[PDB]
Design an enzyme around this catalytic site. Structure first.
Site, PDB file in Angstrom:
ATOM      1  N   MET A 203       0.814  -1.215   0.000  1.00 47.22           N
ATOM      2  CA  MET A 203       0.000   0.000   0.000  1.00 47.22           C
ATOM      3  C   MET A 203       0.850   1.268   0.000  1.00 47.22           C
ATOM      4  O   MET A 203       0.508   2.255  -0.661  1.00 47.22           O
ATOM      5  CB  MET A 203      -0.939  -0.037   1.211  1.00 47.22           C
ATOM      6  CG  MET A 203      -1.702   1.243   1.557  1.00 47.22           C
ATOM      7  SD  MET A 203      -0.754   2.574   2.324  1.00 47.22           S
ATOM      8  CE  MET A 203      -0.082   1.727   3.752  1.00 47.22           C
TER       9      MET A 203
ATOM     10  N   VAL B  75       2.081   2.256  -3.673  1.00 46.04           N
ATOM     11  CA  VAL B  75       1.000   2.822  -4.483  1.00 46.04           C
ATOM     12  C   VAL B  75       0.818   4.311  -4.192  1.00 46.04           C
ATOM     13  O   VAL B  75       0.753   5.139  -5.105  1.00 46.04           O
ATOM     14  CB  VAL B  75      -0.309   2.041  -4.265  1.00 46.04           C
ATOM     15  CG1 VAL B  75      -1.424   2.640  -5.096  1.00 46.04           C
ATOM     16  CG2 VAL B  75      -0.138   0.585  -4.660  1.00 46.04           C
ATOM     17  N   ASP B  76       0.727   4.659  -2.911  1.00 45.95           N
ATOM     18  CA  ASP B  76       0.704   6.046  -2.425  1.00 45.95           C
ATOM     19  C   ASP B  76       1.938   6.894  -2.760  1.00 45.95           C
ATOM     20  O   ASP B  76       1.810   8.119  -2.874  1.00 45.95           O
ATOM     21  CB  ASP B  76       0.532   6.049  -0.911  1.00 45.95           C
ATOM     22  CG  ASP B  76      -0.915   5.973  -0.482  1.00 45.95           C
ATOM     23  OD1 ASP B  76      -1.183   6.047   0.733  1.00 45.95           O
ATOM     24  OD2 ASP B  76      -1.790   5.825  -1.363  1.00 45.95           O
ATOM     25  N   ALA B  77       3.115   6.308  -2.943  1.00 46.90           N
ATOM     26  CA  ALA B  77       4.340   7.113  -2.959  1.00 46.90           C
ATOM     27  C   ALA B  77       4.379   8.133  -4.104  1.00 46.90           C
ATOM     28  O   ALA B  77       4.663   9.313  -3.870  1.00 46.90           O
ATOM     29  CB  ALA B  77       5.558   6.194  -3.032  1.00 46.90           C
TER      30      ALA B  77
ATOM     31  N   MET C 267       1.546  10.887  -3.831  1.00 44.34           N
ATOM     32  CA  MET C 267       1.892  11.851  -2.788  1.00 44.34           C
ATOM     33  C   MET C 267       2.942  12.876  -3.217  1.00 44.34           C
ATOM     34  O   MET C 267       2.925  14.013  -2.727  1.00 44.34           O
ATOM     35  CB  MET C 267       2.328  11.110  -1.530  1.00 44.34           C
ATOM     36  CG  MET C 267       1.182  10.410  -0.842  1.00 44.34           C
ATOM     37  SD  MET C 267       0.006  11.575  -0.131  1.00 44.34           S
ATOM     38  CE  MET C 267      -1.282  11.601  -1.372  1.00 44.34           C
TER      39      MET C 267
END
Lengths: 57, 75
Positions: B55, B58-60, B63
């Site tokens: 998870m 995916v966010d990196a 962001m």
């Protein structure tokens, strides 16, 4: 396993009719092998049918 | 003067792409996690530690695009 299902052959229910498969010889001279088996069957088949259960063979 | 407004606009499109990118990505990943839990409920704490290894990646990148979106908001 955890992936347990419902199936008619796995589920549990109260007896209202009963079945027996029964194995016997095609040939004599075996002594009482058939008769002793058939006597034991007749006792249980009597016991269920007294509960009103139609037996089946 | 249009210089100010179009900087406001450039953040708003960049922000919406980052919001969609994150929300869909972890929605997909989370769906396979819930399939695993329904299939295999003994392992769900193990799968939970796997799902969170993935998870964060995916966010990196979304962001980072939020970081530039907020800087173009701020400046």
């Amino acid at each position: 396993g955890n992936l347990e299902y419902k199936h008619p052959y796995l589920e549990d229910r109260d007896v209202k009719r009963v079945g027996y498969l029964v194995v016997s010889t095609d040939r004599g001279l075996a002594g009482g092998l058939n008769i002793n088996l058939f006597k034991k069957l007749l006792a249980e088949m009597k016991t269920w049918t007294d509960k009103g259960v139609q037996a089946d063979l | 003067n249009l210089n100010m407004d179009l900087l406001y606009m450039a953040a708003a499109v960049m922000m919406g792409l980052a919001a969609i990118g994150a929300a869909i990505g972890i929605g997909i990943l989370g769906g396979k996690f819930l399939e695993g839990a329904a299939r295999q409920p003994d392992l769900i704490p193990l799968l939970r530690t796997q799902f969170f290894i993935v998870m964060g990646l995916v966010d990196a990148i979304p962001m980072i695009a939020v970081g530039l979106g907020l800087y173009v908001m701020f400046a």
